[PDB]
Amino acid sequence: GLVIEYLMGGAYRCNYTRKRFRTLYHNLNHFPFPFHELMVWAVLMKRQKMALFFWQHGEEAMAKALVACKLCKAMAHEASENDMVDDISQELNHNSRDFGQLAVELLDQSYKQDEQLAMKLLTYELKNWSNATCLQLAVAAKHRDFIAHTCSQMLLTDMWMGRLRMRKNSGLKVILGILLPPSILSLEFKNGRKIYEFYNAPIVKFWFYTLAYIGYLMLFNYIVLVKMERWPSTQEWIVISYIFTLGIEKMREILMSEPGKLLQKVKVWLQEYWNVTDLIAILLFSVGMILRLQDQPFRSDGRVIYCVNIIYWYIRLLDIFGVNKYLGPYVMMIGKMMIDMMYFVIIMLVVLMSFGVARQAILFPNEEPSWKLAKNIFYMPYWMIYGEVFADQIDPPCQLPPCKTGAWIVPAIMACYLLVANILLVNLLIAVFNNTFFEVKSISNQVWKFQRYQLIMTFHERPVLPPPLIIFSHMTMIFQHVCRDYGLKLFITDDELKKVHDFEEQCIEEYFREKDDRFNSSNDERIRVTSERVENMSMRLEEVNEREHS
């Protein structure tokens, strides 16, 4: 039980380590689900045929497949970390892939048979598997091909829409409800309290946060564009309050993380790059504000830090855009193409420096050592490949001052430099982007459809008020400090549980039967069976012909 809790994750709790089983085992019965135990035994002992045999017998087949995939992945990682023979790691990874494919195929069959029962199969609480739905197990196993399935996407859409029924033209109606409160009681709701049901939907929280962020960006632009006085104005105080409350919210999110150790929670929070960049930006804004409330030079330095910091908050609109179906994969494709582009940037930088050093050395042979020498190399050779290729700034005409010795090579060097930079490297980069686009596009689609779950969960967990006035919700949590019906799970009775179990057994039997029928009717199997039967028939007929009494 301890090793299963170690392999699965932080929150998992096996049945062996429960107090009831510990008390039963201290003074030493049977198991209600024997194949649940035997499947885990066969998985932990690295017996794939036995595990595949035990998987198809019993209830909760999809949960067993997902748990087996996670266990095999964890065992492979542990074996690789302990410098094994490296064949054990490959075998365990193949076992994990096989179990993942089994889970995906079972989900496909279940969704193809019935839709509502399939969506009920992915959300009911699993008593025997540490109270975690199939979605949580599939996410913990990083199974991208499971969350990207159509049924999982429909389930995520239903969880995202909250308790509202509108599906044709949404978004605008949510904005109308947020901006005009006397329009909430005009929408259809799934089966006084209507306001609470409206404002707790993830989509309404998302649009509230979006509008607050747009207003904050507007105020930031206003305070940086116009002249700043000795003390902050009202808009500047609103911007400062937004930054401060966002920092408080980040601290609260860190404090309420999954692990139990303070330093362990920080490490798991500093995994997404957005969190690290947000921390850096908030710290830089605090430094700029500290410098801003001082005399004139420090005030100018703080204003310049504001002007630098506005760029990051403008860039962070792509995180808001990532909710859109078409603007998410494009942003991720951009992220991958930057890594593809860095190398050609390096090569072009080499060529640019090569031209610039020679031009500056030839045209200016009487220069004392000053740091402007390091600026003339990069400045104009970089600007000239973007449409500033002006002559007489390069290649000066030299009534006229005397021409420098050898100052005719410069037009010849900037005839090869432009040809290399604008005809060769950029066209090769275009070809590289062109021939590596299909794989990047497919990967981006899969990863975005996977991360939809994290988006929906983090907007289900978040408070209802946007960051500029979220301080009220934090004070409410203080009062509740001294004091999931849906969105994660879906609790059902025993009759519904039995119906779900029967549906799953029917689906898995149909899946195996259809797979066997497909295998038996393939051309290769028909050819093989026909060849064997023809060989046996030829032997028998030769025996008959040899055995004659006349």
Ligand X SMILES: CCCCCCCC(=O)OC[C@H](COP(=O)(O)O[C@@H]1[C@H](O)[C@H](O)[C@@H](OP(=O)(O)O)[C@H](OP(=O)(O)O)[C@H]1O)OC(=O)CCCCCCC
Ligand Y SMILES: CCCCCCCCCCCCCCCCCC(=O)OC[C@H](COP(=O)(O)O)OC(=O)CCCCCCCCCCCCCCCCC
Q: How far is the CB of 348 from ligand Y (least distance, A)?
A: 11
Task: CB nearer to ligand X: give 170 or 476.
Answer: 170
Contacts of 38 (CB under 8 A, 6+ apart): 54
Q: Distance between CA 207 and CA 245 in Å, rounded?
A: 18
Contacts of 222 (CB under 8 A, 6+ apart): 235
Task: CB nearer to ligand 9Z9: give 65 or 377.
Answer: 377
Task: CB nearer to ligand X: give 171 or 406.
Answer: 171
326 binds ligand 9Z9 (CB under 6 A): no
Phi, psi (deg, nearest 5) at residue 189 = -125, 140
**Count of residues touching its own copies (by CB under 8 A):** 109
Rg (CA), the chain: 33
Task: Write down the H helix ranges in 84-201.
Answer: 87-113, 115-121, 134-140, 144-147, 150-161, 172-179, 193-199
Torsion of the alpha carbons at 365, 366, 369 and 375, rounded to the nearest 10: -60
User: ∠ at Cα 307 (306, 308), nearest 5°?
Assistant: 90
Choosing among ligand Y, its own copies, ligand X, none, which partner's interface includes residue 252 (Cβ < 5 to 8 Å by kind)?
none
342 binds ligand X (CB under 6 A): no
C-alpha distance across the termini of the chain, in Å:
77
Which 167-226 positions form the footprint of ligand 9Z9 (CB under 6 A)? 218, 221-222
Name which of 162, 163, 186, 160 is nearest 173 in CA terms.
186
Q: Distance between CA 531 and CA 523 in Å, rounded?
A: 12
Q: Distance between CA 493 and CA 503 in Å, rounded?
A: 15
Which 290-319 positions form the footprint of ligand Y (CB under 6 A)? 308-309, 311-312, 315, 318
Out of 274, 321, 383, 486, the only residue in the binding site for ligand X (CB under 6 A) is 321
Q: Distance between CA 43 and CA 39 in Å, rounded?
A: 6
Q: Does residue 70 have a known ligand-binding role? A: no
Task: CB nearer to ligand 9Z9: give 232 or 247.
Answer: 232
Binding mask 197-236 for its own copies (x = CB under 8 A): ------------------------xx-xxxxx--------
Task: CB nearer to its own copies: give 395 or 504.
Answer: 395
171 binds ligand X (CB under 6 A): yes
Choosing among its own copies, ligand Y, ligand 9Z9, none, which partner's interface includes residue 538 (Cβ < 5 to 8 Å by kind)?
its own copies
Out of 183, 277, 458, 530, the only residue in the binding site for ligand Y (CB under 6 A) is 277
535 binds its own copies (CB under 8 A): yes
Name which of 83, 40, 74, 70 is nearest 58 in CA terms.
40
Which 314-333 positions form the footprint of ligand Y (CB under 6 A)? 315, 318, 331-332
Phi, psi (deg, nearest 5) at residue 548 = -130, 140
Q: Does residue 152 have a known ligand-binding role? A: no
334 binds ligand Y (CB under 6 A): yes
Name which of 32, 22, 102 is nearest 66 in CA terms.
102
Phi, psi (deg, nearest 5) at residue 171 = 90, -65
Hey, what are 78's tokens?
């542990």
Q: Which residue has the tokens 């190398």?
A: 343
Which 386-445 positions form the footprint of its own copies (CB under 8 A)? 386-391, 405-406, 409, 411, 413, 415, 418-419, 422-435, 437-438, 441
Stretch that binds ligand Y, among 130-138, 272-280, 287-295, 361-369 (CB under 6 A): 272-280
Name which of 55, 65, 120 is nearest 499 in CA terms.
120
Name which of 131, 74, 94 is nearest 491 in CA terms.
131
Out of 323, 373, 413, 488, the only residue in the binding site for ligand X (CB under 6 A) is 323
Q: How far is the CB of 230 from its own copies (least distance, A)?
A: 14
Torsion of the alpha carbons at 218, 222, 228 and 233, rounded to the nearest 10: -60
Q: How far is the CB of 443 from ligand X (least distance, A)?
A: 16
Q: Distance between CA 312 and CA 416 in Å, rounded?
A: 38
Name which of 201, 135, 192, 196 is nearest 165 in CA terms.
201
Stretch that binds ligand 9Z9, among 147-155, 266-274, 364-372, 525-533 (CB under 6 A): 364-372
Q: Does residue 130 have a known ligand-binding role? A: no
Hey, what are 397's tokens?
């005409």
Task: CB nearer to ligand Y: give 138 or 352.
Answer: 352
502 binds its own copies (CB under 8 A): no
Choosing among ligand 9Z9, its own copies, ligand X, none, which partner's interface includes residue 210 (Cβ < 5 to 8 Å by kind)?
ligand X
Choosing among ligand Y, its own copies, ligand 9Z9, none, which partner's interface includes residue 218 (Cβ < 5 to 8 Å by kind)?
ligand 9Z9
Angle, helix 202-225 to helix 296-315, in steps of 10 degrees: 150
Task: Write down the H helix ranges in 192-293.
Answer: 193-199, 202-225, 234-255, 262-269, 273-292
Residues facing residue 31 across a β-bridge: none
Choosing among ligand 9Z9, its own copies, ligand X, none, which partner's interface includes residue 172 (Cβ < 5 to 8 Å by kind)?
ligand X
Q: How far is the CB of 526 from ligand Y (least distance, A)?
A: 49
Choosing among ligand Y, ligand 9Z9, ligand X, none, which partner's interface includes residue 389 (Cβ < 5 to 8 Å by kind)?
none
Residues facing residue 164 across a β-bridge: 189
Out of 57, 194, 267, 325, the only residue in the binding site for ligand X (CB under 6 A) is 325
Choosing among ligand 9Z9, its own copies, ligand X, none, which partner's interface includes residue 171 (Cβ < 5 to 8 Å by kind)?
ligand X
Binding mask 371-410 for ligand Y (x = CB under 6 A): ----------------------------------------
Which 370-409 positions form the footprint of ligand 9Z9 (CB under 6 A)? 370-371, 373-374
User: Which positions make up the binding site?
Assistant: 170, 325-326
Q: What residues line the site for ligand Y (CB under 6 A)?
A: 272-274, 277, 280-281, 284, 308-309, 311-312, 315, 318, 331-332, 334-335, 351, 354-355, 413, 416-417, 420
Q: What residues line the site for ligand 9Z9 (CB under 6 A)?
A: 218, 221-222, 369-371, 373-374
Q: What residues line the site for ligand X (CB under 6 A)?
A: 157, 170-172, 175, 210, 320-321, 323-325
